[PDB]
Design a protein around this ligand. Structure first.
Ligand SMILES: [Mg+2]
Ligand SMILES: [Mg+2]
Lengths: 267, 94, 300, 94, 301, 267
DNA sequence: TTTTTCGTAGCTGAGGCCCTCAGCTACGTTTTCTT
DNA sequence: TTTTTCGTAGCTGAGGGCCTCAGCTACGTTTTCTT
């Protein structure tokens, strides 16, 4: 799923090709055939012609924050492909298919196989234990005073520095994960572990890779103890997303998770 | 009878008081009331006759698309503009 | 220092506005159209269900973001007024709604119940007993040609069929533009109700399948007669007057008010309840904020 | 749905634009629209939350005696006054 | 540089406003109430049918002139809210109206037809055949005491008859007095606006407000007195304010201002006679009357 | 019959008496018993107590211009006496009573009896003649260029100077005549010669005395040719009204005119 | 006895409020979902 | 190959529009009705 991030300039059409234009002239040539998805970062302006071309070749436009740390708008709202959405939905609706998917997700979380066949609620218990344990481990590795995960969903300024950092990091992660889910052509609202939230599926997928990179960075920045912690975490997450191709590697993971249903994928 | 709003700017004290005869002034130059069509037209002829160098906009409630209509007298940087029948406000550059 | 921005119900909104000739920016958190000379024109984006961007417009990142946050659909159209592209919130905000729609669409018998209801609402009577979806679609083809002929003679407009080249005659241009407006507000409504435009019952496998279904239910009740009226009036520039006519017909027949209930009713004919969350599922950690807008739009 | 008028003074650009989301600005600080009760209350909490040092008056059409009602936020020389249930405006001395 | 000021229809107006504690002036052609501290309060005088001046008010010449020009009746009231004095345009603007009323009032048989109509409108049925005006007045006395008793029992208020002191009585009588005062206010306003003389009545006669008494008595028990009893049972410290609010509400709910002029016109119409045409020997009108947006009795331009 | 003009001050009550008060203290004591009618000229302010007293003793308040050259508002609107209004109305309604009244008006106007019983339309003709003759006579006595009575009821400024003067003078006259009619307790709208106007009766009475004083002064001032003619005419009329007791002698005339009906007056 | 006294409109200059913008700097952000 | 480029919010001082008032002067007047 080829994609490009565009920033600081106007997206226009020249000779049937996508073009990014500055005061300095043509900044970036994009052949129409080479991109399935265009991510528009802040400071972009879309010409009508660009949109018309994108429609003609069926290219997804996604208005995002930097590096995709935020998703704000999407072309083709609700998804453009029936078969993808129906694949996801069929997986979510059938008890055994759903169970296969959930077990795969948990296995990806645990490394390799969750226990043979004891229930899901019970797996959620294990995962809770492991998550708290991981918080403690990172807390000791980076040397940060840790009194548990605590935050007020209504007042951002009450928890300690490390909790602000964690929250901001996970926020950015939810950004790129939503981006990837949209690029794959699925609905963020339809999840398997999480349900009943606009980004349940995002939470499902994000929790799989949450602790490899960005939460550790939350801890690192937490110990560095800067003037503006949350902002440093956001920028750091942006940098990590750009350097380590997070969005690019998120999509195979998603497709794998769903593939575990042992039902065949579309085109 | 429907709700009426009259907004005056740089208008003589004569017109200020004259509007105060029928309407309630809630801020300087901003009058609110509730009048019938015919009374609204008479008030408008009062405005057109007494505004002099000043400029006025009048908006009233209707059962049309947007729920209200408005019309102006004199020059203002903010002037009405037509978009396929929807009347909005254009803000002219200095 | 800051307060969240949320969508308002679709019924409370003006149907649509067409914007052309300018760059669309954000100033002090407001949607603004600026032209070559510097003339600003503020557009109450939250009070509008659908914004139509015509050729020669250039939309800033901030503007698109803003339009999404208040749940206003942006629709890029070419001229002859045809819908080209659309932008809005990434998707439905409620899992159960989407799973409801998908479950209805995937099961043939349920699908059939929904289609039968669509037929009843569209034509004014029950579809004949014992018919598949393709046979119902056949019946619909017949009746549709009958309706085109009838309108063609009532308004007295020469009718040689539905024809267009990606140009057509006046009645076809008018039909294309009117239908475009209808697809605009209908897509808006479908997204606001919290459903996917791509998952349809009569039309399928197309990016706007459900839009086609729902729109076809009220199309000849609403926008096409007006297209014929204007066609007979024979204007220089059909599209603007088609816009005015469509706005008027939408307001008079209270379309925006009835679109979400219509959708909900159509789906309700499946005789099934939107699926409850699995008991094995992880409970919602942070409760959804109560919203003044429609169920499908995101809030806070 | 009923007609709405909001008049702001010395209010931050934040609130000016925020109001411009739903209402039409016909003069500086003067906004006109047509909204339901609940939306009106929401706009009011937007005003109460964003007006800061400024002051605002909001009037809307009703089925009451005078055809409309109005309420204020912040201090202004023109302030509402009650006369046996009829609400008028008192103009305070300097 | 100048544009005339004219009255607007009575139906389009707020019924009444009570003013107290201050001097009433004109500023830039507007009616204004100013208190001891300098606080101004503009009164949309044209939008009001009746302005009530309580004790402690002082009205400038310009204010009275202005109130007359827009055809707003000024009514000076004492405490307990009783009407004391009134001011407005010098009189009816139409000759034929006044001559119509007078011709109806002077002829016994026409007068009787008008009174019979009043009776029908008031009680809900035809008066008995062949009754004189005084006999109808007797019937009305009886029915009125019956109505006071009925309201007294519905609202549960002790009723020992209609009693008042000239500077008192029980709460219910104070309330009745204030309410009735409001009704007489708007009714005098209506009578003047329709273009008739308040002094020329049919049931009550020889009194400065005879016609006012007639017309008001037609709707009094339909409107202001029940509300007087309601407030009476509520037992407030100072009834008059609560009575004012209650009367405004009842006037608004039962569309009193809208129905007062038609009521009058209908009452007089029962005489089955047309307002007299100008004599053919009369001097023709040299300058045509200006078309008016207001009611027929008020002067224009 | 008695009346007083009050000017420049506040009307209050002291010791049960009407009082006119300025900054210098009590300006005018008015015993309550001595006035039937109070004429409030510009610059007056009425206390509530004064009004209350006036109601108690049944005194008519009349808001007027200076010297009564304008009438603006009246207490007891519509008239306070039934018998007066009914007297006037009965006179106006009965063909022959009206006829006697009209005939008396014309005789007072011509100065001694109108012809045997020439009809009313014929009298209107004869007097039209007399009026034109009087305009001409005054025009030669005061030596003013006279091209007839001409004026535009919609544009005050297109007639000649003398027509403006005539109009302003008659205007003031209509003022005091209305004042007198109100003081007598009659309705200005119900006239005998003129009908269908709010001031028909005013025109009836005013036309009787019009040419004795104020029209000649209109001509005098016209010949003086001042900067502001209409204003000088108004002031001159005010002075004439104050000095010559015009309002006071207007009332017996009115009562006589009506008395000509040979029907009995009230109290 | 020589009692110019009151209420209101027009005019102008002083004072002050606040809208509007140019010009500069800082920013890509209003988050948390196995607490 | 060393490519900082775009759109928008916050801030502040300059310019200016217009509301408000004190202080002064002039005024009692927006008419005509047998043209
Ligand atoms: Mg179809
Ligand atoms: Mg009685």
């Amino acid at each position: 799923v080829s994609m490009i991030f565009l920033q600081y300039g106007q997206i226009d059409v020249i000779d049937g090709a996508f073009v990014l234009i500055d005061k300095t002239g043509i900044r970036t040539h994009i052949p129409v055939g080479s991109v399935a998805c265009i991510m528009l970062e802040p400071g972009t302006r879309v010409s009508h012609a660009a949109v018309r071309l994108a429609a003609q070749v069926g290219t997804l436009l996604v208005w995002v924050g930097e590096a995709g740390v935020r998703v704000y708008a999407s072309g083709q709202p609700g998804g453009a492909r029936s078969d993808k959405l129906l694949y996801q939905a069929k997986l979510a609706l059938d008890e055994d298919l759903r169970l296969k998917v959930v077990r795969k997700m948990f296995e990806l979380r645990f490394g390799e196989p969750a226990p043979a066949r004891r229930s899901v609620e019970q797996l959620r218990g294990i995962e809770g234990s492991r998550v708290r344990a991981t918080y403690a481990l990172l807390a000791k590795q980076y040397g940060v005073t840790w009194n548990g995960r605590r935050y007020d969903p209504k007042d951002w300024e009450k928890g300690d520095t490390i909790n602000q950092c964690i929250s901001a990091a996970t926020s950015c992660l939810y950004g790129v994960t939503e981006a990837a889910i949209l690029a794959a052509g699925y609905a963020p609202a339809i999840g398997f572990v999480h349900t009943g939230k606009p980004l349940s599926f995002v939470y499902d997928i994000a929790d799989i890779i949450k602790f490899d990179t960005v939460v550790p960075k939350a801890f690192e920045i937490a110990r560095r103890n800067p003037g503006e912690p949350d902002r440093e975490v956001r920028l750091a997450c942006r940098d990590i997303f750009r350097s380590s191709k997070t969005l690019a590697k998120l999509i195979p993971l998603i497709e794998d998770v769903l593939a575990a249903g042992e039902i065949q994928p579309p085109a | 009878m429907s709700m009426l709003v009259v907004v005056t700017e740089n208008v003589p004290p004569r017109l200020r008081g004259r509007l105060a005869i029928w309407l309630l002034e809630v801020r300087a130059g901003v009058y609110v009331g509730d009048v019938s069509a015919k009374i609204r037209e008479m008030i408008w002829e009062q405005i057109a006759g007494l505004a002099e160098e000043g400029n006025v906009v009048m908006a009233w409630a209707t059962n049309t698309e947007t729920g209200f209509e408005f019309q102006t007298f004199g020059l203002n940087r903010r002037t009405p503009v037509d978009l396929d029948g929807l009347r909005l406000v254009s803000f002219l550059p200095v």
